[PDB]
Design a binder for this molecule. Structure first.
Ligand SMILES: CNc1nc2c(CCc3ccc(C(F)(F)F)cc3)c3[nH]c(N)nc(=O)c3cc2[nH]1
Ligand SMILES: CNc1nc2c(CCc3ccc(C(F)(F)F)cc3)c3[nH]c(N)nc(=O)c3cc2[nH]1
Ligand SMILES: [Zn+2]
Ligand SMILES: [Zn+2]
Lengths: 351, 351
């Protein structure tokens, strides 16, 4: 039987790594893309949504999220505070947690994720808004580190969870190297199964995000997986892998419902009239079932007609494109040609 | 190679028949349900929509509807006037045809259907509004019969169409037995490959529809297929088969996008809170892939969350339910137990 959690690195090129995470419910090939489940080796559950509808205790009554969704492989859940702060109408923050229109604390977040039955559990953190002053970023990061210890202790108190799931800590510190270092040190002292880079993809832009990754990822333990939260476009993924990221989480699903398809030649808006007579598939190389069978012209027609089928075909293609991207990344690292792949990818994607 | 068109009756029970239509692109088992293609042995194309977007000449440039949609089996198209009269903003009717905000005439309707490349072509008719006085129903039916002859002649003038497609005539006459008889006589004198009962499912209600079918279907040639246009709910289908109908055309697709699932125990609205914890599949006997894998509770969750996936699962189930219904109808007629099936179906569907 597979272990609770075991990360092995099979090959490296620069800071890029490729390998596997073994968990009880399956193996996760890295670098990994983790799509939303309601849209792969692992999918994301939506803690914030589920805790409100139908509620975590109701999901548990129905047998947990794996049974509920019909997915027997690993599931990752976020800790819910990012979404509370982004989407909730009124919020009140304190050392105990966040109250919103409900109190979400480290202990309650871990318990919710336990009731949902997810395999990779995120610590309950605060995603510092951007921009942040050094003082505010430090106070925020310090609270997140106290919450990371509380998250660790709550997870360890639940036997079923401690024995069968894994817990990731989340680095904060905004764009400041010294605070990122303090955060990494605090997380490593507590000890986690994996480490996420939090507080990015919050308006800073790709150049700044990459600059922060340049110094932040090496601060995390090398022998554990690195998860960049909230990222991202295909070019963000490639650049983050070049900087040592192993795991990524939404755009392909959102894009698919809004007319946007990803291709090796960049994104296209299939509703544009230039596709009305285009008999090529969405992407010329894509092996997905949509591209095996249907043209841009027909998908354009369906979306313009308001047919749900059009958006679903777009979404299927986008998810498959992302997984082909991840496979090409894994193969190129394993073959020692990832630097060349990244160069060729960018030249064509942006041409 | 299959013939252009050949209808064979394999078994009968009362007025009900089961058999096959052979056409060049495939065999159609009857009684047949014909779903919309943009949602089976045959699908429906949407003449009215296609003639406006992208236009019939553009569909032909793209290789015809079979290539466009990725469907190599038979396609049926309506003649477009029903939809023009239902949906168009302004219309002007004359002996030549209908002008609307375009002129659609028998000749142009046949040409459009030729450019689309459909296999079963409907004559261009007028669906008389309900209720209609005897005088208005007669004048309308008489115009439709003149248009049926023009449709026949236009179809026969196009070699590719005459040699590879089939043409159905459409009976009109509102609810009046004498006019239905005159219409059937006129259509049989012209000669068609199949015969549709038009002018029903326009607000008259099931009792009146069945009363009209009781006398109208026997007026059509017994040795040719009978297509009831616009029908309908599962109970309408069963009763129409009991009255000699062989072919049916939308509700399962519309219902699937509006929260309604068909089951052997009647329709259910999956958004209702009573399904939020219901672990049973949509239908307890359905063999479709949705019912093999997911619960009412999860489909409820997806639709309530606004996820496109929920509506698509509902639609897949509804289409599959309809096809299981048709298979049970065909099998029960072939086995001589259709009368019993209809009785058992109604008792449970309405319980
Ligand atoms: C978009 N930018 C971004 N997203 C971020 C997220 C949310 C991750 C998430 C949550 C739920 C889903 C769901 F679709 F499955 F619902 C998908 C992804 C973060 N989460 C935490 N905990 N700390 C962070 O510092 C952080 C930074 C993030 N930047
Ligand atoms: C709803 N009631 C109804 N629909 C009727 C229709 C439309 C059939 C049709 C057209 C297009 C589609 C599409 F979904 F594929 F687009 C699907 C079905 C009739 N059509 C003609 N020609 N004469 C009639 O006398 C008649 C009576 C009809 N009663
Ligand atoms: Zn594709
Ligand atoms: Zn089903």
């Amino acid at each position: 039987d597979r272990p609770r959690f075991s990360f092995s690195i099979a090959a490296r090129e620069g800071k890029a790594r490729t390998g596997t995470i073994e968990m009880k419910r399956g193996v996760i090939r890295t670098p990994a893309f983790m799509p939303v489940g309601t849209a792969a080796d692992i999918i994301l559950g939506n803690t914030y949504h589920l805790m409100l509808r139908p509620g975590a205790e109701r999901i548990a009554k129905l047998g947990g999220l794996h049974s509920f969704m019909g997915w027997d492989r690993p599931i990752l859940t976020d800790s819910g505070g990012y979404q509370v702060m982004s989407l909730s109408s009124l919020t009140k923050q304190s050392e105990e947690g966040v109250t919103f229109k409900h109190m979400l604390s480290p202990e309650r977040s871990i318990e919710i994720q336990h009731l949902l039955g997810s395999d990779i559990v995120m610590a309950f953190d605060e995603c510092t808004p951007y921009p942040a002053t050094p003082s505010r970023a430090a106070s925020s990061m310090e609270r997140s580190m106290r919450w990371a210890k509380r998250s660790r202790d709550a997870f360890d108190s639940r036997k079923e969870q401690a024995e069968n799931a894994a817990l990731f800590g989340i680095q904060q510190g905004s764009v400041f190297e010294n605070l990122r270092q303090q955060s990494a040190d605090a997380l490593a002292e507590i000890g986690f199964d994996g480490y996420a880079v939090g507080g990015l993809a919050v308006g800073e832009g790709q150049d700044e995000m990459f600059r922060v990754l340049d110094f932040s990822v090496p601060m995390l333990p090398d022998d554990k997986p690195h998860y960049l939260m909230g990222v991202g476009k295909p070019d963000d993924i490639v650049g983050a892998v070049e900087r040592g990221i192993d795991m990524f989480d939404v755009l392909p699903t959102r894009s698919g419902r809004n007319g946007q398809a990803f291709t090796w030649d960049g994104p296209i808006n299939i509703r544009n009239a230039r596709f009305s007579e285009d008999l090529k598939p969405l992407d010329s190389e894509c092996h997905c079932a949509v591209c095996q069978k249907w043209s841009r012209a027909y998908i354009h027609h369906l979306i313009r007609a308001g047919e749900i089928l059009g958006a679903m075909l777009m979404t299927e293609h986008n998810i498959a494109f992302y997984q082909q991207l991840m496979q090409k990344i894994r193969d190129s690292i394993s073959e020692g040609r990832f630097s060349q792949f990244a160069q060729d990818f960018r030249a064509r994607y942006f041409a």
